[PDB]
Design a protein around this ligand. Structure first.
Ligand code: HEM
Ligand code: HEM
Lengths: 108, 294
């Protein structure tokens, strides 16, 4: 794709290190600060159940595909202004590759 | 004789732009070495260095303070309440070689200003003019705070820096950043979830979590919330003091406000003890990497 695809062992530690404080990926997994990210890909932004999303995350309604997802992670507030996810973003393509790839796989 | 007088002296014909360049270097490098401390980055540690180099000030005789860039002398450098800041010192030695004209004092503080702005905190006006001072101006170890205390040690420790209750509560919101490291200080854990982005999480956590006091492995006690955060005695003490607690509630409610008090305080912190002639330039507001297309 336009987005490459990378190491999923790496993506894994990046996720455990940078996203885990707020998010789970396992199925049924509990929302935290952030929604449970299971079956993220293929869903529209703002759909996780029994999680309260800023109207901004709902009103953007984008399908989460590895591509719009990568633009998002680079800078969550530029992408969905008003979003309340407090992340600075991943400025590194590998990182983005490595993570997405991991996610791809973890949120099946 | 009255106290010592420290006049800020601009670096020989330098100007904003010369200083926006230093920022950019620091800023970028924070973008580059992002793996530090499990990907927290060098953000938290540089803001902590900024605070420690300034926190030695004594308003009664005007000694200590940012002015002299004395943290660079072993005495100071080796102060045990300074453990872990060597990591912040190293991160800027490179940049110092790049710009050898800027004084040590101007670098350590510009650095904390960069880190706050770069982590999406408010803008912090900043001024230059700190001048380097002989090894003799090095403050003895022990002018920095203990963690293991209560609201009253806090209120008083701060009158020495000339800060009030609102300024002390605002400054502490910086505890949203980083975490404590047991090898550095006997405490362990983060205050919150977004350790590298500047918000008012510090205050919502303080009041919405469920804290239980407990002992760490270093054998010290701390307050742990079920959620994985910790609070030091001195932080918890902020909600046990009726007066600290209403400022804490203000701030948990209104980030702008916090953002405005913090900037006023942080800068007041960094300029303490320094006299600016009436001819010095107005404080600078630097642009972020974001604002510059980066
Ligand atoms: C690299 C790390 C992270 C990744 C990959 C990630 C992933 C995501 C995604 C895909 C969404 C949209 C969910 C949806 O539309 O259903 C989201 C929302 C959210 N995330 Fe993150 N997240 C990360 C880091 C964090 C962090 C560090 C925090 C908190 C400190 C956090 C808290 C949130 C919040 C609160 C939302 C909902 C925001 C809103 O409703 O505006 N996430 N995250
Ligand atoms: C009562 C006064 C204070 C006490 C007792 C205190 C104590 C501490 C301790 C014990 C740590 C962790 C050290 C480590 O393991 O590296 C720490 C970290 C830190 N402190 Fe405070 N602090 C105080 C006030 C402040 C103020 C006023 C600021 C800033 C404007 C500040 C900024 C920070 C930051 C940003 C960190 C995280 C550093 C990192 O992630 O490496 N502290 N503080």
């Amino acid at each position: 794709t336009e987005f490459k695809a990378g190491s999923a062992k790496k993506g894994a530690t990046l996720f455990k290190t940078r996203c885990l404080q707020c998010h789970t990926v396992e199925k049924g997994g509990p929302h935290k600060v952030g929604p449970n990210l299971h079956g993220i890909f293929g869903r529209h932004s703002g759909q996780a159940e029994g999680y309260s999303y800023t109207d901004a995350n709902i009103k953007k309604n984008v399908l989460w595909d590895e591509n719009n997802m990568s633009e998002y992670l680079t800078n969550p507030k530029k992408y969905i202004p008003g979003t309340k996810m407090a992340f600075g973003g991943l400025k590194k393509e590998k990182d983005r590759n490595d993570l997405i790839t991991y996610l791809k796989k973890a949120c099946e | 004789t009255t106290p010592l007088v420290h006049v800020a002296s601009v670096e020989k014909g330098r100007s904003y732009e010369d200083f926006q360049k230093v920022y950019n270097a620091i800023a970028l490098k924070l973008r580059e070495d992002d793996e530090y401390d499990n990907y927290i980055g060098y953000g938290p540690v540089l803001v902590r260095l900024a605070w420690h180099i300034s926190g030695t000030w004594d308003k009664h005789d005007n000694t200590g303070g940012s002015y002299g860039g004395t943290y660079r002398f072993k005495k100071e450098f080796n102060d045990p309440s300074n453990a872990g800041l060597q990591n912040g010192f190293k991160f800027l030695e490179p940049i110092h070689k790049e710009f050898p004209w800027i004084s040590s004092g101007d670098l350590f503080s510009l650095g904390g200003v960069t880190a706050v702005q770069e982590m999406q905190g408010p803008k912090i006006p900043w001024r230059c003019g700190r001048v380097d001072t002989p090894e003799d101006t090095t403050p003895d170890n022990g002018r920095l705070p203990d963690a293991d205390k209560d609201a009253g040690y806090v209120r008083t420790f701060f009158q020495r820096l000339n800060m009030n209750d609102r300024e002390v509560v605002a400054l502490m919101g910086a505890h949203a950043l980083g975490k404590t490291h047991l090898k550095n200080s006997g405490y362990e854990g983060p205050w919150g979830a977004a350790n590298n982005v500047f918000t008012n999480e510090f205050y919502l956590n303080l009041l919405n979590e469920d804290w239980k006091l407990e002992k760490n492995d270093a054998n010290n006690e701390q307050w742990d919330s079920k959620s994985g955060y910790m609070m030091l005695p001195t932080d918890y003490s902020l909600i046990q003091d009726p007066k600290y607690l209403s400022i804490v509630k203000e701030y948990a409610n209104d980030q702008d406000k916090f953002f405005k008090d913090f900037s006023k305080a942080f800068e007041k912190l960094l300029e303490n003890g320094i006299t600016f002639p009436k001819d010095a330039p107005s404080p600078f507001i630097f642009k972020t990497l974001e604002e510059q297309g980066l």
